[PDB]
Design a protein around this nucleic acid. Structure first.
Length: 121
DNA sequence: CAGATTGTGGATTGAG
DNA sequence: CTCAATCCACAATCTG
């Protein structure tokens, strides 16, 4: 357990994918857009990059984009979230000891910004 | 071609 | 109890 923002990785990835131009994003583009939106990874640790890559494959919300039907074994494909399938309790703010008080720092729920067309600060 | 990155997924941990 | 976070491993493409 390392210092990460109190939002599930699923909601973090789902946000940057919807906030993107064509609602598709490559792994690297997901990595840097997540890092700047939730600026709590600019330190020494690096394993959070794996956790995101692992979350994309291990969730049925995220699907790949087929570049070439002749090479379906290709990598670097853009990922697309399918918002309707995101459990509503996965977007709420994570109950940790960091959010015992002073919670006014972070929003309570990312559903408006993910599936309701609102702007995240 | 070596080294970096992607995609997958099996297994353990700490915490709620 | 449960489950997100983290670990570590392997396979295979991607890049220069």
């Amino acid at each position: 357990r390392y210092n990460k923002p109190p939002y599930s990785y699923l909601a973090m990835i789902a946000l940057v994918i919807q906030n993107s131009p064509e609602k598709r994003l490559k792994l690297s583009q997901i990595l840097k857009e997540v890092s700047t939106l939730f600026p709590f990874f600019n330190g020494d640790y690096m394993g959070w990059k794996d956790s995101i890559r692992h979350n994309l494959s291990s969730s049925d919300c995220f699907k790949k984009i087929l570049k070439d039907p002749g090479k379906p074994q290709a990598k670097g494909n853009f990922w697309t979230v399918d918002v309707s399938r995101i459990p509503l309790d996965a977007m709420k703010l994570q109950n940790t000891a960091l959010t015992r008080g002073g919670s006014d720092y972070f929003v309570q729920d990312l559903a408006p910004y993910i599936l309701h067309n609102y702007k995240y600060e």
